[PDB]
Amino acid sequence: SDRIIQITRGDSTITSQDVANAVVGYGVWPHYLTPQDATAIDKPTQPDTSSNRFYTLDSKMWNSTSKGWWWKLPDALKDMGIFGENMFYHFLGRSGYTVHVQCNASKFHQGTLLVVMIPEHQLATVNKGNVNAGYKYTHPGEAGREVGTQVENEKQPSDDNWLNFDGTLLGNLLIFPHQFINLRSNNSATLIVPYVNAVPMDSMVRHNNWSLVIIPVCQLQSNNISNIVPITVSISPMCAEFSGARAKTVVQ
Amino acid sequence: GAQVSRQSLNYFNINYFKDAASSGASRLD
Amino acid sequence: GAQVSRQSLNYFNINYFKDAASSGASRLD
Amino acid sequence: GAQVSRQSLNYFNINYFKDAASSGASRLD
Amino acid sequence: GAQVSRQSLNYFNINYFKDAASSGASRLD
Amino acid sequence: GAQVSRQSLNYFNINYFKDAASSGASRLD
Amino acid sequence: NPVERYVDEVLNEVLVVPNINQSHPTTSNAAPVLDAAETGHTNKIQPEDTIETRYVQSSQTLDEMSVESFLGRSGCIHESVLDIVDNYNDQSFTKWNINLQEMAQIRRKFEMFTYARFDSEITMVPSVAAKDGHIGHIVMQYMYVPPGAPIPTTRDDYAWQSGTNASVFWQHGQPFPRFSLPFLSIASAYYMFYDGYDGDTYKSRYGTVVTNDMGTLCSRIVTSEQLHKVKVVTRIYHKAKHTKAWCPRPPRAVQYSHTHTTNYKLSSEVHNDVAIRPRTNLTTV
Amino acid sequence: NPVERYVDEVLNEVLVVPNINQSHPTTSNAAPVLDAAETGHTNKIQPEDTIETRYVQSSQTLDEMSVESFLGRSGCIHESVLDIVDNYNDQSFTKWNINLQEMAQIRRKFEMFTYARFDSEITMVPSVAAKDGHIGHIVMQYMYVPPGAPIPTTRDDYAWQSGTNASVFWQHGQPFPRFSLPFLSIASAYYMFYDGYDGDTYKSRYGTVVTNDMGTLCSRIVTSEQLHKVKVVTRIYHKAKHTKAWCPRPPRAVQYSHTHTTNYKLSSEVHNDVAIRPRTNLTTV
Amino acid sequence: NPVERYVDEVLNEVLVVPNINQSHPTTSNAAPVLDAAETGHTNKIQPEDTIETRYVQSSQTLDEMSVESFLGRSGCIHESVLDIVDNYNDQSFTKWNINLQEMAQIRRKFEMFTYARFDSEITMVPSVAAKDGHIGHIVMQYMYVPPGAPIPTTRDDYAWQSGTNASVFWQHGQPFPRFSLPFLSIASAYYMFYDGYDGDTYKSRYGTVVTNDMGTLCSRIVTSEQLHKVKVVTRIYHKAKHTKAWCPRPPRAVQYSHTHTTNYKLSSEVHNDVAIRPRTNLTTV
Amino acid sequence: GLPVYVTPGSGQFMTTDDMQSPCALPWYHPTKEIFIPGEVKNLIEMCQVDTLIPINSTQSNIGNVSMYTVTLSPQTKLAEEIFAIKVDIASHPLATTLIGEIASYFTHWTGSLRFSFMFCGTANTTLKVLLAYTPPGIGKPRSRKEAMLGTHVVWDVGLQSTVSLVVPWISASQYRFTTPDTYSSAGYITCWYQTNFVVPPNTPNTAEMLCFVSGCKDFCLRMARDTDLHKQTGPITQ
Amino acid sequence: GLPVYVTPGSGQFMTTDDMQSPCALPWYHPTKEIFIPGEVKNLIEMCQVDTLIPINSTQSNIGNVSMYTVTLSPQTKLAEEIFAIKVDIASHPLATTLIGEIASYFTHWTGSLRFSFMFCGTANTTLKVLLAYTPPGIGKPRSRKEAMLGTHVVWDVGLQSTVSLVVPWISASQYRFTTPDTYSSAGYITCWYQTNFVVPPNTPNTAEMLCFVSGCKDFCLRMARDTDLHKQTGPITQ
Amino acid sequence: GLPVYVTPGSGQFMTTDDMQSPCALPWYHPTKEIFIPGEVKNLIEMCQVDTLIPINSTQS
Numbered sequence A: 001s002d003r004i005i006q007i008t009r010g011d012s013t014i015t016s017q018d019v020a021n022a023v024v025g026y027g028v029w030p031h032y033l034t035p036q037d038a039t040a041i042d043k044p045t046q047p048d049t050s051s052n053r054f055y056t057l058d059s060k061m062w063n064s065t066s067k068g069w070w071w072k073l074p075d076a077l078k079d080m081g082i083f084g085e086n087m088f089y090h091f092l093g094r095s096g097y098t099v100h101v102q103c104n105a106s107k108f109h110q111g112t113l114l115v116v117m118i119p120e121h122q123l124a125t126v127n128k129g130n131v132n133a134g135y136k137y138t139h140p141g142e143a144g145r146e147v148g149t150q151v152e153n154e155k156q157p158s159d160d161n162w163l164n165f166d167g168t169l170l171g172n173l174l175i176f177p178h179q180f181i182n183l184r185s186n187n188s189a190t191l192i193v194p195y196v197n198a199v200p201m202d203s204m205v206r207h208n209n210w211s212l213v214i215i216p217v218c219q220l221q222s223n224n225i226s227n228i229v230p231i232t233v234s235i236s237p238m239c240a241e242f243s244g245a246r247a248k249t250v251v252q
Numbered sequence B, C, D, E, F: 001g002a003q004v005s006r007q008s009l010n011y012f013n014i015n016y017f018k019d020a021a022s023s024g025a026s027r028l029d
Numbered sequence G, H, I: 001n002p003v004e005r006y007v008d009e010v011l012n013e014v015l016v017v018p019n020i021n022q023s024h025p026t027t028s029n030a031a032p033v034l035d036a037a038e039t040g041h042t043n044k045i046q047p048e049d050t051i052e053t054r055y056v057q058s059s060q061t062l063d064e065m066s067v068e069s070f071l072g073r074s075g076c077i078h079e080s081v082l083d084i085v086d087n088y089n090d091q092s093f094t095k096w097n098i099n100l101q102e103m104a105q106i107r108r109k110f111e112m113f114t115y116a117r118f119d120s121e122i123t124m125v126p127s128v129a130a131k132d133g134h135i136g137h138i139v140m141q142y143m144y145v146p147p148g149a150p151i152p153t154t155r156d157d158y159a160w161q162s163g164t165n166a167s168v169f170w171q172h173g174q175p176f177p178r179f180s181l182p183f184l185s186i187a188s189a190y191y192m193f194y195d196g197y198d199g200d201t202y203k204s205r206y207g208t209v210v211t212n213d214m215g216t217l218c219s220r221i222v223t224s225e226q227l228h229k230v231k232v233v234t235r236i237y238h239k240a241k242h243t244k245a246w247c248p249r250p251p252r253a254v255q256y257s258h259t260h261t262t263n264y265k266l267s268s269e270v271h272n273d274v275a276i277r278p279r280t281n282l283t284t285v
Numbered sequence J, K: 001g002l003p004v005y006v007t008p009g010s011g012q013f014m015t016t017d018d019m020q021s022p023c024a025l026p027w028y029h030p031t032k033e034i035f036i037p038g039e040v041k042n043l044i045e046m047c048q049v050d051t052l053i054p055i056n057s058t059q060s061n062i063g064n065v066s067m068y069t070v071t072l073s074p075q076t077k078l079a080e081e082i083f084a085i086k087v088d089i090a091s092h093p094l095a096t097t098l099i100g101e102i103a104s105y106f107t108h109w110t111g112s113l114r115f116s117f118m119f120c121g122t123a124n125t126t127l128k129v130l131l132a133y134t135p136p137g138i139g140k141p142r143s144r145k146e147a148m149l150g151t152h153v154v155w156d157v158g159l160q161s162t163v164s165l166v167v168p169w170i171s172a173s174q175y176r177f178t179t180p181d182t183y184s185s186a187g188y189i190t191c192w193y194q195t196n197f198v199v200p201p202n203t204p205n206t207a208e209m210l211c212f213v214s215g216c217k218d219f220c221l222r223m224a225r226d227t228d229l230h231k232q233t234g235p236i237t238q
Numbered sequence L: 001g002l003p004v005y006v007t008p009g010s011g012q013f014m015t016t017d018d019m020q021s022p023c024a025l026p027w028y029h030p031t032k033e034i035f036i037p038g039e040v041k042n043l044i045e046m047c048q049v050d051t052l053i054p055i056n057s058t059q060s
């Protein structure tokens, strides 16, 4: 059936019996760095199955007033087993991902989530002059950020979902790799994205390559509101490889 | 852009720019 | 720097300087 | 407008404009 | 002063004056 | 006025005007 | 054939749009008009699928819509001012930290892409205003100072010797100066956006300021002090050549406020901050 | 042979007129001189048919009478004035809604056809009048603003950045600026006349104003305010290249009064309004 | 193939750097990392010898690092001043004993070699400052006077006739003058350094002044005295072409004090005289 | 030397000229190009991707995601109008969509537009809607019967959530102006209830609908111009 | 004459242009070239030669040859730090070395660096030292254990007096700025006692060490610029 | 560079000259030409058509 999907990565297998196909970002499947594009000269470490597996983040609750959520990669996985360890023990890292967003309800519920993967989502601050988003705020980890909850601070990024948190209109986010989780049609979204950057490998501690943004464009509604409807995200690194081994970087 | 003819009387109908609008007056007929 | 084609309609794609950055707009596709 | 002769000593009697009046002094005889 | 190569990609390494000092930067190696 | 030699190293000894006095310095010997 | 290709260039018919084919009535259990936007794909339905079309030969071309064409137009990126008011030595030279972020028109176009790689053509338009009447003989010097090279602190600084740096001297009356610059980045492409920092602390810088340092442009009136004061304004124009772009993104919807950042300001009446004109209601066209 | 054709171009002998052949006396029941103008056709009688002609070899050519030649001469179509009187910011820039209707000389020639298709060559002749004595360093900017693009409202408007629009910068002392423009219409030909409206109500516009919108030409003195005031008059000249024309019509017989309309005014003595000189009577030559 | 070589020139890929090859773990009695600097040779160990490297294809080129490139940039070597103050006849002409020792920027680069052979390209940038308001019609004469030729002692000296010497006349408004000079030495190469004297006595001269005499450059304003005084500053730029260099040496570490000599001055706090920034201690990075 | 004739235009600087110029950095070798996914070679590639139309952009909705949704509900009157907009690619509310934004960088447009709609109600909510395109030369339809006489699609909501209506290029001229021009106004698109929004008991009585737009295989833009959908009212500083 | 179009840029003087110009001395025949040993054709040749690092350039040592030596001696505490410097080619104390000086005439650099050390103690003095390179993205190591986790060489002093540590090119970008730039800082090199400085009786209890640096086969500089390691604060007179 | 001799006439603008000039709208593709009846290629075509003479053009 075209409604079913099984994704196996390492020791993890994920299923969904109500999918809306899958999207491969920019039509390129993740792959290891080739010698023609490489620059760092040391032999890379490739953890394989111990790193390229599904890691499930903290679930979020979707309710009638939710404004959205976002996570940044690789930041969201910095504390996820072997993948996390490798990104702090090495200066350079490189990886692709399989993002599987999960959200089931019922045939009597309605709502629509816009799931987008944005490359170089450089957040903006509002009405704060040339003060830019603070490192701490763009590195929330697996908890991600719940839009419209954070008590503002000077280095606090924008929480304007309609302006993509960066000064562009929400309706045009569809130009980026995306999928919709329309409760009447599917209960999950799957996006496979390759490594995208102007350099072959980069510091995973100070450069977030992709940003996962989830915005409910159609409010969650039903006649059984007491039943909590969560949103769960499972991300699996792909072709993760690291370079420049040394001591473990400790942030903060 | 050079239309080189030969007869010797060689003709060089050069077009210096890449847009047709740029060329001079048209030939006749 | 001259790419001389022939068809006669001869094309002369001359590159006057020695650095690639110096050339004009790129061709398409 | 090019009258190319060869002998090598090649002659190029170029006519830059399209009207006969435009050319320089006439040859003799 | 013209070093005409062919490959068509024809090269014209012209030397406009009669003294070697007059030419531009040297080639390499 | 073009004395085209070939060796390829092609020489173009052009005489732009029609009077011998107009040419540049003479060759030697 | 490079000559046929050449003709296409002259006529601008390198990229032709497809024709519309004649279609007919249909009664099928295959419904092209129905699909699922959830997939993240655009339904590729064409006019022939929804109505009965006639055959039409298309003569439109997409040449002008190419990235080379879109970004291949020279636009202003800086207006340098040298206003001689009361101190020639201090007011006859200046410097600018180069960037393509100060003028909204070209900035917005480049920012419709995440990464871009191109060579640059810079053309300068100097205009000398005779504040006191005469302009004399104005000769300008524009010196490109790569990051690290010594920046002149006086109009007679030794750095102006330009022993290695590239300087362009312009003489009033002569045509506008112009030169080309190869792709300058240390990376494979320029970052139009950069979700990164130059460190991992609360005080680390964020954005393209971390990656896009192109150096400094130092200008000076070479001519020594003259009786009559002048105000020289040099406008720098930039054009992208041999361009490549990656990962398209939404166009800037609000005004820019600063360089190297996506920051913006919102008023109490946000509809005034965007180009969206409020509708009376859903049925009022 | 393109070389023989070339020689014809140089000598202007591409289109030769026929020869006159020798004729003789005739006595026939075939009367070429008699016909019927009612048919709407012109009797094709030639001199050999009415008199006894000699043989004459014609050497006349019709090259100069070609449409390309007739419309291929540069004529003035606009005189732009920038007169600095008392406010530099307001008086240093202007705009013009482009059209070929403001100057009678070229307008009349184009209007001898119903439709015309051509490329344009624009040449500009700027002249700076030194009202106070010196002119300083004048640099002009002519920006073509297609319909829809933002029109600058001040001399420092961001639109002058010309990030996409085509701007031409001229420096006083340098040769007259000149550029070519491809056939600009959204239709297959330009309408010289248009018996139509942009709607079906009493207030709908009538004529070519509905179809011939070519945008706006915005000019500005780039140089900042100078001590001495100047009056810059830029005359725009237009020439048609690679021309095609359809359906010839009668030449304008009365003076033009407005653009985009055939409207005219008549005095009480109409003979003064037309080029017809009153005859004394039918037999006074 | 001269065409393939040509492409390499355009792309600047004439000199490519080697690739990094993949290496593996080793356990051997051959220790490349160990050597003896006493030999005066540099240990040629490469990254593959000390760590496990991956295979990487190099795309870097050394073209820009060539001697031709390093010394092939035009830098200022002299600033000639003709300041008309109160005596036109005396102040309208001057002379300079040619040398490449007066401007630190290019001097330091050439002095990184012991001997150098090259042709020279001289470009001059004259700027006329209107001290009193108008500049009139300025025409300059730059005459090269080889050692031995008569040096003009007045602005109307017969030597200005330039019957044999090479003179360059420049007219204000015309492009910057420029000419080439063949390798001028009587030896096979120019001495950048010379551990010798022009004799064997206590009063013999020491250094390059003995070997590097290039003559004198004599300048004069050709125009006769004008009402308004001007200050003409002519900056001479020099570029090396078709260069060859021998025996590289350490770069100048302290400021230059005089021409043709390595002499220098030291303050009581020598760390201020060199570019070395004092370290706090051995472990403070 | 070779006799030359300096032609008019010499020395001028035309922002759209295509000339060569010396390189300020001779011998410099650019950084090696690496493969980066997502290369764009022509803007048409961006015009063929669906983006949301801020169709419900009433003053109160602007600044809210709700400006992108149209609400549907059980009707008491038959054949009611749901929405109506102009088809003109750069008119509002189409202006800020990706295709509208790009079209605003050009003067002329041509081709067919593809409008898609995705129903967001429950899986148990049914509905039949009529989407119509009214060619120019007439006012927007006042009733379903009037609209129905033009180009239209009857959308039946079911397993497949999305439908597409194609606005064919029906014009006198081969191109139209991107900027609002009476002579080149392209017409209207209206939406009407074909049957009705029906739901079982205990099911939300309203539902949202999303609207998309993109260009068909024949879409084409011409004559580059600066956009009027973005401005700079002051200096952009550091 | 031939119609021409004068292009923008005409008449300008760009210090890096590459044009031809008439020769002021026609007919002149240059002096015959003779063979001179030591011809240099590319600056890379100079970058591949070892030069001493003024590593001990403390204010008191500058102006003394001692600024070029590091002193070693018997330790009472194990794994003590000996020295630490930045790997950045144009940073201090690397700046005044031949490779640092040449790199300062360019804007970008890439490649691997070769650091060599020569022990100058007596033939009877033994020692084992750990030389480490710490890639960026972390502070300089605070201990031998921390340093040891990165790239390193354990040097055993013996018959062969010199050892070489290669700092591999480990970077995100293909090039780095020669001038101090946060984004392109290359890391650190630290030296620690692996065992200890040991000597027999009647042998000096301290010894010196010399430090060298040069570029590997992949070292490369780009974008010529004027150096900031030398200035002119006044006229240079006769 | 190639030595040149600037000839008299240079820089002038003659309304009847025939030169080339750069195109302000590069890449622009003109609207397709369609068949329109009545094309005129030479004014002689109009001179060969009969038109009425206002022969009785007395002031009245």
Ligand SMILES: Cc1cc(CCCOc2c(C)cc(-c3coc(C)n3)cc2C)on1
Pocket (backbone or CB within 6 Å): G098, G099, G100, G120, G122, G142, G143, G144, G166, G167, G168, G181, G184, G190, G191, G212, G214, G217, G236, J024
């Ligand atoms: C992204 C991105 C790409 C760039 C490069 C812009 C080019 O900037 C320069 C300008 C305007 C002038 C010169 C320059 C060089 O030489 C002279 C005289 N001026 C050099 C550069 C790099 O900046 N940001």
Ligand SMILES: Cc1cc(CCCOc2c(C)cc(-c3coc(C)n3)cc2C)on1
Pocket (backbone or CB within 6 Å): H098, H099, H100, H120, H122, H142, H143, H144, H166, H167, H168, H181, H184, H190, H191, H212, H214, H217, H236, L024
């Ligand atoms: C019929 C018909 C045909 C036309 C086109 C006339 C051309 O008008 C223009 C002029 C005079 C100048 C420019 C222009 C473009 O770029 C610059 C600097 N000026 C552009 C146009 C379209 O107008 N009516």
Ligand SMILES: Cc1cc(CCCOc2c(C)cc(-c3coc(C)n3)cc2C)on1
Pocket (backbone or CB within 6 Å): I098, I099, I100, I120, I122, I142, I143, I144, I166, I167, I168, I181, I184, I190, I191, I212, I214, I217, I236, K024
């Ligand atoms: C070493 C070394 C090599 C040289 C030669 C420098 C070139 O100097 C000259 C300059 C600046 C101008 C002229 C010159 C010749 O003709 C004119 C008008 N000016 C001639 C020379 C030799 O000087 N030191």
Ligand SMILES: *C(=O)CCCCCCCCCCCCC
Pocket (backbone or CB within 6 Å): B001, B002, B014, B015, B016, C011, C012, C013, C014, E012
């Ligand atoms: C046409 O498409 C290109 C036009 C090129 C202009 C340059 C014309 C001069 C060519 C001289 C070449 C001489 C041949 C050896």
Ligand SMILES: *C(=O)CCCCCCCCCCCCC
Pocket (backbone or CB within 6 Å): C001, C002, C014, C015, C016, E011, E012, E013, E014, F012
């Ligand atoms: C390309 O690498 C060199 C470019 C040379 C520029 C000069 C072009 C004109 C050539 C005219 C030669 C005529 C042939 C006999």
Ligand SMILES: *C(=O)CCCCCCCCCCCCC
Pocket (backbone or CB within 6 Å): B011, B012, B013, B014, C012, D001, D002, D014, D015, D016, K002
């Ligand atoms: C004659 O009818 C046309 C005159 C063309 C003028 C241009 C002459 C220069 C031709 C250079 C071509 C070089 C050949 C490869």
Ligand SMILES: *C(=O)CCCCCCCCCCCCC
Pocket (backbone or CB within 6 Å): D012, E001, E002, E014, E015, E016, F011, F012, F013, F014, L002
């Ligand atoms: C070299 O020794 C002589 C250099 C001649 C300069 C003129 C170059 C232009 C030649 C054009 C000839 C076109 C061929 C038919």
Ligand SMILES: *C(=O)CCCCCCCCCCCCC
Pocket (backbone or CB within 6 Å): B012, D011, D012, D013, D014, F001, F002, F014, F015, F016, J002
């Ligand atoms: C000699 O008698 C006539 C000199 C002609 C001067 C023009 C030289 C340039 C020729 C270019 C022709 C290019 C060949 C196709």
Ligand SMILES: [Zn+2]
Pocket (backbone or CB within 6 Å): G134, H134, I134
């Ligand atoms: Zn005056």
